[PDB]
Amino acid sequence: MVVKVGVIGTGAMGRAHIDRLTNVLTGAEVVAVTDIDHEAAEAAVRDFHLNAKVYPDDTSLLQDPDIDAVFVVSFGGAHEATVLKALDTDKFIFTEKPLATTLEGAKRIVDKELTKSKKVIQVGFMRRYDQGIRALKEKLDTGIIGAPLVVRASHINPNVASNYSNEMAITDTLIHEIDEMHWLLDDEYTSIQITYPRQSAEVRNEGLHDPQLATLTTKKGTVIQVLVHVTAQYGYEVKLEVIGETGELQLPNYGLGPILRSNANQQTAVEMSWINRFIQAYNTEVQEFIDEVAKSEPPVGPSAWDGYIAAITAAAANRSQKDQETVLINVAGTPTFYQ
Amino acid sequence: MVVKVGVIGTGAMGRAHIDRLTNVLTGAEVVAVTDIDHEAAEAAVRDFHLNAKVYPDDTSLLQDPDIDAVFVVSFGGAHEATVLKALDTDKFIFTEKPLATTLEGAKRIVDKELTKSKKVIQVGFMRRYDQGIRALKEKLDTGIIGAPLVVRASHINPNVASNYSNEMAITDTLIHEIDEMHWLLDDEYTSIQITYPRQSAEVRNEGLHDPQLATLTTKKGTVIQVLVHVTAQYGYEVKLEVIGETGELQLPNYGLGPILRSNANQQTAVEMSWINRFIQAYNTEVQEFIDEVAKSEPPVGPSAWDGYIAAITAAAANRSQKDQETVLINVAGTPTFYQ
Amino acid sequence: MVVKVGVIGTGAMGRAHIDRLTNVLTGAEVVAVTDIDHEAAEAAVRDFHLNAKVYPDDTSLLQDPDIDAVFVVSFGGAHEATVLKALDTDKFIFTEKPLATTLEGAKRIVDKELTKSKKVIQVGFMRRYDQGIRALKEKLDTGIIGAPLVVRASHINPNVASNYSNEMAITDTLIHEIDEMHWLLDDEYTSIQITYPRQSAEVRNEGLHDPQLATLTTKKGTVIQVLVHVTAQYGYEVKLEVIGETGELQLPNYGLGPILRSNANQQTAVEMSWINRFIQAYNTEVQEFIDEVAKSEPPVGPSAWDGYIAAITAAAANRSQKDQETVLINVAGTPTFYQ
Amino acid sequence: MVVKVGVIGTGAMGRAHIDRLTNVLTGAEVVAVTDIDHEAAEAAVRDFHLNAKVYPDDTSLLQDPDIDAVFVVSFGGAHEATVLKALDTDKFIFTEKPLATTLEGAKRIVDKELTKSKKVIQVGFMRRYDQGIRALKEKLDTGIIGAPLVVRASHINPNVASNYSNEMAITDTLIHEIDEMHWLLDDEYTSIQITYPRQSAEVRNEGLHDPQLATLTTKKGTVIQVLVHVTAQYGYEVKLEVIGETGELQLPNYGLGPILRSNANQQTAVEMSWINRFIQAYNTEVQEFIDEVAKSEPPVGPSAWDGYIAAITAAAANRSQKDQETVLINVAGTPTFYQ
Ligand SMILES: NC(=O)c1ccc[n+]([C@@H]2O[C@H](COP(=O)([O-])OP(=O)(O)OC[C@H]3O[C@@H](n4cnc5c(N)ncnc54)[C@H](O)[C@@H]3O)[C@@H](O)[C@H]2O)c1
Ligand SMILES: NC(=O)c1ccc[n+]([C@@H]2O[C@H](COP(=O)([O-])OP(=O)(O)OC[C@H]3O[C@@H](n4cnc5c(N)ncnc54)[C@H](O)[C@@H]3O)[C@@H](O)[C@H]2O)c1
Ligand SMILES: NC(=O)c1ccc[n+]([C@@H]2O[C@H](COP(=O)([O-])OP(=O)(O)OC[C@H]3O[C@@H](n4cnc5c(N)ncnc54)[C@H](O)[C@@H]3O)[C@@H](O)[C@H]2O)c1
Ligand SMILES: NC(=O)c1ccc[n+]([C@@H]2O[C@H](COP(=O)([O-])OP(=O)(O)OC[C@H]3O[C@@H](n4cnc5c(N)ncnc54)[C@H](O)[C@@H]3O)[C@@H](O)[C@H]2O)c1
Ligand SMILES: O[C@H]1[C@H](O)[C@H](O)[C@@H](O)[C@H](O)[C@H]1O
């Protein structure tokens, strides 16, 4: 039987999730949408040829007893209230990152969810579903390189829009590494420090420091060094290397495109779009959520607790951005509800 | 509109197609299976959690009016008779390659399909759908390396099953390159020659020569040299390099797994089977077939004519296997029905 | 004690040998030169600040008792007469390839040398000294991929000078693979065949076919497929892949220059000069010859007998070039002198 | 004319330099040796078949007026007194790193050398001669990736001797990157900080922290992150990546050995020996020193001033090791004598 979905926020990512549910993946149908821009909502219904109701607000959508699951794809600051409203229903909830824009918001969600009989929230941290990243985690977990001592990673993006702020270097960009590392390492963070190398001449945005170096430490003592470089020009690239006691593991060359020998060079194209880079991870992530809902079983992907860990760490990082000082992180032990 | 599918042949690839149709692709349901090994048919229904009839043979399955399309996924030598019986019904037909294992068989299929009012057969030449191979063709077609002069290709398998015959090195294996190079170069063949290098000590099948070298020449004078090596031990691999007037294009190494530095070596895993190497291509071709059937429109993928044109070159190569001499090829023009 | 050298032929490669012996390598001194262009010989003395006597021809240089070894670096057609003259002395002889330009010339040399008490000739087939090619041979010889069944090789050159003839595709270019493959495989050739794919638009030379495909067969049954492509435009490149029973070995990309990520590509430079490509091989080859002469031991590099196998094979290829038909090769058993 | 050399310290590296000078490089002869272990000095003369006198100490060796240059290859702690004695002679001086084991001893040597009528000291920082590293610096200096913002490097070593101490992670290992980076970037350091990630289980030496992370900052604001990992097990490896405003540059994998396809993986060998890794750089640096001396010209390699920069920065690093705090660096401007 088909999972009936409502979508709250029908903007760029909302429409892309609608397209996934409608055109790409199996077992779901979007039967309801809402957007504070009523005309965005009508356009979603029209462009994707949906047989769906346009609701005036999230409150009304969430009262429709035929919707099995809701996708919350509104502005980040709008997630917390919408997730809290959806937690008064029995519906499963897929929320894009962040779970909330403040860690207090994220704690409100984790507390209302823990009153429920079962977990219903998955948060859209897609990196965990990326085939290469997953495969590296699985190899690490065999023990073949011993314990992880240091992780080195890069999050490289060619250019940013005029609205991109210094804070978004954490909340839009580093946030992916923030969710990924504790999961990769099965460990908890103890601190984060953001430092600023010399400022690139490519930055055109007031207040934006680029590149940024993030250093995170974990309870077992692993150090994570992430380079965030968002005006890098050359391409979009995610790099990850785990230094172990007895060996190292790293992500391979990404790309399907041909090797060209021409004009005294050998070359391959580099991805320019994060959207294309993570197409597979988004498909896999959403298909898994739908397959869980179809079985009436809780999601198994990143939970509200992961959303809360990410919110606390992002807050610690935004605080570090002010003076480049290390900010301690102490995350409470995970409730068994979320193991 | 959900396409109800029957699958004839539920071994490795029959199972892989059932898996994809059931769990990955959209708009299809497997409702019937058959295999000459009834236990294999029952195992497929159980393992993939199907609600499907198990028919004792293809003729009974084909006479069930509720089936919209059949997949022929039996031993290559069995396709011809099943496809001919299926053409007695109004069902759409996806057959794995080869279309038949002889030229006469392929021609019988084409002669019978031509009597129908609509084309119904798609042949599973998935290489044309592989994103990497497509990206190479696309780059070639820009003219960046000038005209293609020589093509070098490898088709590598780690080992073969006990029913793999010398003739199958052509009809089961080289058949992919026979189809692919015609499509890649938009050109037709004028001859083929098979030669036998030093016989591998790894061969375990009576009568099988391995490796085999195939040289194909085209009308424009491109020479293609294919290495077929089906007892290679190390892995499953497809390599393609196009040598142009002003440059070269090569498919990159396929792999998602990590790079491991350990024990005085840096290494990456090689795939051991087609099942993962070409999963995207299989998914794309089968989704396209299902999408056409859902519209009651002819398939747009490789046709029985492509299968026949391939069989003519394959039959020439089976003739060349006998004395290692060059065999001339000159195929008929495409009938209107197949344009 | 320094090895006193005379150099016969002070053109491009003669000066390069003088420079190696004077400025790079250890244990030798050029004390004599001769060239049919007397002005070039005198310039070689001034240019490299030699304490050396300029002789009017090779006969007179060869009468200098103080010379321990001569380098024959004249036009290929002149090598045979000079090598036969040098063999009337007791001096060691390094001749650049070819040993002689005809197979009968090569045999006169071998027959004359067999009359001597010790072997004194080394032929300048430098591929055997290239570290990359040597490392590949060494790994092959560990048995790790089992027996070699097929070799696929490329000799890629960006453009040729106006004097470059069709026969030079063999005598100047393929000759390196001709000496290399029997050594690599510890085997003897039984045939060679040259075929012409479609002619490249880039060819500006009268009578030149480009590319050419050379197929060699060996006594143990290994088939060698060499692509010779001398108007390739993009670079100078030597490629070598050995297909074994249980694995494969290939040369890595040549070059130490950095990987550049820029402008939506990842790239590395390709060598444009064969001179640059084989700098190390030439140094190592010549240093070994000098080291052997310093000990008054016979050379251990490619011998006059190797020069003879090369000459016979090149003659057979030139004959094949006439009609693209296979030409048999039956090389005599190696005399004890050359084991 | 032949450069006559005396070698002070005939241990592992002293014998390796004697071997270079005698058997590999051109234009030098070892005519005198001394070592505090007289039997080691006598053994070096025998083993290398030198026509050399054995002196009981450096003072007596330095009185030999026939020596043109001395190589100082004793314990690091002995370099300063010996270099100061040598500066009372007119001999050229090649000292292995370090110039001196304190920044004050390095300053003494600089001050003394400044009183002389020519620069005579070269310090054995061989990284600058490595062809790969040089090629990367050359490409960076074209401006093609814009200004360098971040440098990430690794110094990976398989295991250490039982006498390898925590401070040697700086003075024996990191010292190479300490000399290399200011040269690569043409910039001066402003600070260094050493941090200790998780302690590896592979460390067998009391007090040795491994791995160690070193962060250096430069005047223009480039941040350098070096990973030092000396019990890494898998191999010896030097990695270098320069992150620029508009692109990146990285050293390719070291090694000329083949790519092996075998046993479900594609692999290349990793060097286990720092000796073999930098054999080219050592030969090139010493050949360059000898060539300068032969012309009675001052050396052009790393000078006593580079020795001093390295000693100041090493000192700062050893101080940082105490509490993992950032230590400021402010080197005086470079004297004209050393430009
Ligand atoms: N996981 C990822 O990689 C990823 C990628 C892109 C976006 N996202 C997240 O998706 C969310 C949406 O981003 P986007 O790029 O589509 O932004 P967007 O601005 O295009 O779209 C947001 C849509 O939400 C609507 N909206 C806003 N507030 C609402 C409310 N209270 N109720 C209903 N609708 C509301 C807006 O009118 C708009 O149409 C953000 O949280 C973003 O962080 C995640
Ligand atoms: N396109 C590709 O990449 C690709 C990959 C694998 C297989 N194939 C093709 O798929 C077909 C099946 O191969 P496989 O690997 O699954 O082999 P398999 O041996 O695993 O399975 C073949 C199945 O067919 C059954 N069978 C044989 N004759 C039959 C008949 N007359 N009617 C019904 N069932 C019959 C067998 O009992 C068996 O279960 C072959 O044609 C092969 O060439 C294509
Ligand atoms: N092993 C290799 O890869 C390699 C590379 C380059 C050249 N070579 C060989 O080196 C030889 C010279 O080539 P080059 O590139 O230096 O050619 P070149 O034309 O530059 O030099 C040849 C020199 O030989 C002189 N000469 C001609 N006949 C002579 C004679 N009878 N006695 C003395 N001198 C004579 C010429 O006047 C000229 O100075 C050729 O045999 C060539 O095939 C080999
Ligand atoms: N640049 C590089 O990469 C590199 C590499 C290795 C060593 N080094 C340097 O080389 C020097 C020697 O290292 P090594 O590995 O050969 O060590 P080693 O212990 O093998 O040799 C040192 C030798 O010095 C002798 N010696 C000690 N004190 C002496 C003195 N006062 N006078 C004369 N001889 C004395 C010892 O007896 C011994 O034979 C050190 O400074 C080391 O740091 C540099
Ligand atoms: O050689 C195999 C090919 O690689 C696959 O693509 C199928 O055609 C099949 O299993 C053949 O046996």
DSSP codes, D80-147: HHHHHHHTTSS-EEEEPSPS-SSHHHHHHHHHHHTTSSS--EEE--GGGG-HHHHHHHHHHTTTTT-S
- E strand or H helix at C132: helix C131-141
Quickly count: other Cβ atoms within 10 Å of residue A161's Cβ. Answer: 7
Identify any residues that bridge with D61 across adjacent strands, giving them in sequence order. none
Spatial separation of the C-alpha atoms in residues D272 and C66, rounded to whole Å = 46
For D301-318, b/e burial (b = at least 16 CB within 10 A) is: bbbbbbbbbbbbbbbbbb
Spatial separation of the C-alpha atoms in residues D39 and B13, rounded to whole Å = 74
Q: Any alpha helices (H) in D126-213, and if so which ranges?
A: 131-140, 168, 175-185
> What distance lies between CA C223 and its chain's CA centroid?
22
Adjacency order of strands within the sheet including C121-123: C53-54, C28-34, C3-8, C69-72, C92-95, C121-123
Whose structure tokens read 């006691």?
Answer: A245
Would you state the CATH architecture of domain A1-143+269-339?
3-Layer(aba) Sandwich (3.40)
Domain B144-268 in the same topology as domain B1-143+269-339: no
CB contact under 8 A, A144 and B260: yes
Spatial separation of the C-alpha atoms in residues A305 and A121, rounded to whole Å = 9
What's the gap in Å between A167 CA and the centre of ligand 1? 17
Using DSSP's 3-state secondary structure scheme, residue A143 falls into: coil
Backbone φ and ψ for B147, nearest 5 degrees, come out as -75, 145
Question: For chain B, what is the total number of helices (H) and then of strands (E)?
Answer: 11, 15
Angle between the D304-323 and D175-185 helix axes, to the nearest 10 degrees? 120
Pocket test for ligand 3, best of C19, C34, C73 (most atoms within 8 A of CB): C73
Angle between the C38-47 and C12-19 helix axes, to the nearest 10 degrees? 20
C120, C298 contact by CB (below 8 A): yes
Spatial separation of the C-alpha atoms in residues D181 and D306, rounded to whole Å = 12
* A159 lies within 8 A of chain D by CB: no
Spatial separation of the C-alpha atoms in residues A19 and A47, rounded to whole Å = 10
Whose structure tokens read 């795939």?
Answer: B271
CB contact under 8 A, C265 and A263: no
- E strand or H helix at D31: strand D28-34
Which residue of chain A has the CA closest to C271? A264
CA C51 to each of CA A244, B87, C30, C45, C47: distance values in angstroms, whole numbers, following the listed order:
59, 91, 8, 7, 11
Spatial separation of the C-alpha atoms in residues D34 and D44, rounded to whole Å = 10
Spatial separation of the C-alpha atoms in residues A204 and A201, rounded to whole Å = 8
Using DSSP's 3-state secondary structure scheme, residue B239 falls into: strand
DSSP for residue D20:
I
Spatial separation of the C-alpha atoms in residues C220 and C233, rounded to whole Å = 36
A126, A281 contact by CB (below 8 A): yes
DSSP for residue B77:
G
Which residues neighbour D63 within 8 Å (Cβ) at sequence distance 6 or greater?
none
Which residues neighbour B335 within 8 Å (Cβ) at sequence distance 6 or greater?
B114, B305
Spatial separation of the C-alpha atoms in residues A186 and A339, rounded to whole Å = 12
A138, B260 contact by CB (below 8 A): no
CA B113 to each of CA B4, B90, B93, B122, B154: distance values in angstroms, whole numbers, following the listed order:
22, 11, 11, 12, 33
- E strand or H helix at D40: helix D38-47
Of A284, A157, A255, A289, nearest in space to A212 by CA: A157
Which residues neighbour D55 within 8 Å (Cβ) at sequence distance 6 or greater?
D6, D32, D33, D34, D41, D61, D64
State how beta strands C92-95 and C121-123 pair: parallel
| Structure tokens, C68 | 């321990």
| Structure tokens, D55 | 């002196």
What's the gap in Å between D129 CA and the centre of ligand 2? 60
* C234 lies within 8 A of chain A by CB: yes
State how beta strands C3-8 and C28-34 pair: parallel
Backbone φ and ψ for C84, nearest 5 degrees, come out as -60, -40
Give the number of the atom of ligand 5 that is nearest the alpha carbon of residue B96. Answer: 8
Torsion angle of alpha carbons B252, B253, B259, B262, nearest 10°?
-130
DSSP letters spanning B263-312: TTEEEEE---SHHHHTHHHHHHHHHHHHHHHHTT----SS-HHHHHHHHH
Of B70, B143, B250, D105, nearest in space to C152 by CA: B250
Spatial separation of the C-alpha atoms in residues C102 and C106, rounded to whole Å = 6
Adjacency order of strands within the sheet including D121-123: D53-54, D28-34, D3-8, D69-72, D92-95, D121-123
Angle between the C304-323 and C175-185 helix axes, to the nearest 10 degrees? 120
Which residues neighbour B260 within 8 Å (Cβ) at sequence distance 6 or greater?
A139, A144, A145, A247, A248, A249, B266, B267, B268
B76, B172 contact by CB (below 8 A): yes
B325, B193 contact by CB (below 8 A): yes
Q: What is the total residue count of chain D?
A: 339
CB contact under 8 A, A265 and C269: yes
Could you state, in order of their start, the residue ranges of all structural domains in chain C? 1-143+269-339, 144-268
Backbone φ and ψ for A76, nearest 5 degrees, come out as -50, -45
Of B279, B284, B316, B275, nearest in space to B302 by CA: B284
Looking at the complex, report in whole angstroms how far the Cα of residue B132 sits from the nearest Cα belonging to chain A. 5
Using DSSP's 3-state secondary structure scheme, residue B211 falls into: coil
Which residues neighbour C315 within 8 Å (Cβ) at sequence distance 6 or greater?
C102, C103
Please say whether the dihedral angle defined by the alpha carbons of residues C175, C176, C177 and C180, taken in this order, is positive or negative.
positive
Whose structure tokens read 């080394």?
Answer: C122
State how beta strands A237-244 and A327-328 pair: unpaired
- What is the C-alpha R_g of chain A? 20
D326, D320 contact by CB (below 8 A): yes
CB contact under 8 A, B265 and D261: no
Angle between the B79-86 and B103-113 helix axes, to the nearest 10 degrees? 10
Spatial separation of the C-alpha atoms in residues D272 and D277, rounded to whole Å = 8
State how beta strands D259-262 and C247-250 pair: antiparallel
Chains with ≥3 Cβ pairs under 8 A against D? A, B, C
What's the gap in Å between D255 CA and the centre of ligand 5? 35
Question: Which residues 244-303 of D have a C-beta within 8 angstroms of C?
Answer: 246-252, 255-263, 268
Identify any residues that bridge with B214 across adjacent strands, giving them in sequence order. B194, B226
What's the gap in Å between B297 CA and the centre of ligand 2? 27
Angle between the B103-113 and B304-323 helix axes, to the nearest 10 degrees? 170
Instruction: Pick D261's closest partner by Cβ from B235, B262, B265.
Output: B235
| Structure tokens, A178 | 């923030």
| Structure tokens, C63 | 């009468």
CA A24 to each of CA A287, B122, D155, D255: distance values in angstroms, whole numbers, following the listed order:
9, 22, 46, 45
CA A88 to each of CA A3, A91, A93, B195: distance values in angstroms, whole numbers, following the listed order:
20, 9, 11, 73
Spatial separation of the C-alpha atoms in residues A44 and A13, rounded to whole Å = 12
Looking at the complex, report in whole angstroms how far the Cα of residue B214 sits from the nearest Cα belonging to chain A. 24
Spatial separation of the C-alpha atoms in residues A196 and A208, rounded to whole Å = 11
Adjacency order of strands within the sheet including A121-123: A53-54, A28-34, A3-8, A69-72, A92-95, A121-123
C307, C171 contact by CB (below 8 A): no
CB contact under 8 A, B256 and A25: no
Spatial separation of the C-alpha atoms in residues A90 and A69, rounded to whole Å = 9
Spatial separation of the C-alpha atoms in residues B242 and B238, rounded to whole Å = 14
Q: Which ligand has the nearest atom to the CA of C59?
A: 3
Backbone φ and ψ for D240, nearest 5 degrees, come out as -150, 125
Answer whether A124 contacts ligand 1 (Cβ < 6 A): yes
Pocket test for ligand 3, best of C13, C123, C306 (most atoms within 8 A of CB): C13
Of B1, B178, B171, B154, nearest in space to B79 by CA: B171
CA C323 to each of CA C194, C294, C319, C327: distance values in angstroms, whole numbers, following the listed order:
9, 48, 8, 10
HEC readout, A218-284: ECCCCEEEEEEECCCCCCCEEEEEEEECCEEEECCCCCCCCEEEECCEEEEECCCCHHHHCHHHHHH
State how beta strands A121-123 and A92-95 pair: parallel
| Structure tokens, B314 | 């394959």
What's the gap in Å between B18 CA and the centre of ligand 2? 13
Fold of D144-268: Dihydrodipicolinate Reductase; domain 2 (3.30.360)
B70, B46 contact by CB (below 8 A): no
Burial of A220 (0-12, 13-18, 19+ CB in 10 A): middle
Which residues neighbour D19 within 8 Å (Cβ) at sequence distance 6 or greater?
D48
Identify any residues that bridge with A32 across adjacent strands, giving them in sequence order. A6, A53
**Which residues have any ligand 5 atom within 6 Å of their CB?**
B 157, 172-173, 176, 230, 274
| Structure tokens, B159 | 């080992």
Question: For chain A, what is the total number of helices (H) and then of strands (E)?
Answer: 11, 15
Of C147, C239, C227, C130, nearest in space to C186 by CA: C147
Backbone φ and ψ for D136, nearest 5 degrees, come out as -70, -45
D87, D66 contact by CB (below 8 A): no
Whose structure tokens read 């500006």?
Answer: C204
Task: Report which residue type is found at D312.
Answer: I
DSSP for residue C335:
P
Answer whether D275 contacts ligand 4 (Cβ < 6 A): no
Backbone φ and ψ for B265, nearest 5 degrees, come out as -140, 150
D185, D222 contact by CB (below 8 A): yes
| Structure tokens, B51 | 């609600």
Burial of B162 (0-12, 13-18, 19+ CB in 10 A): exposed
Of A316, A327, A301, nearest in space to A97 by CA: A301
Give the number of the atom of ligand 4 that is nearest the alpha carbon of residue D37. Answer: 37
CA C244 to each of CA A15, A86, A235, C178, D23: distance values in angstroms, whole numbers, following the listed order:
52, 62, 39, 20, 38
Of A241, A254, A249, nearest in space to A142 by CA: A249
C144, D262 contact by CB (below 8 A): yes
Q: For this experimental structure, what is the resolution in angstroms?
A: 1.6
| Structure tokens, A102 | 């403040």
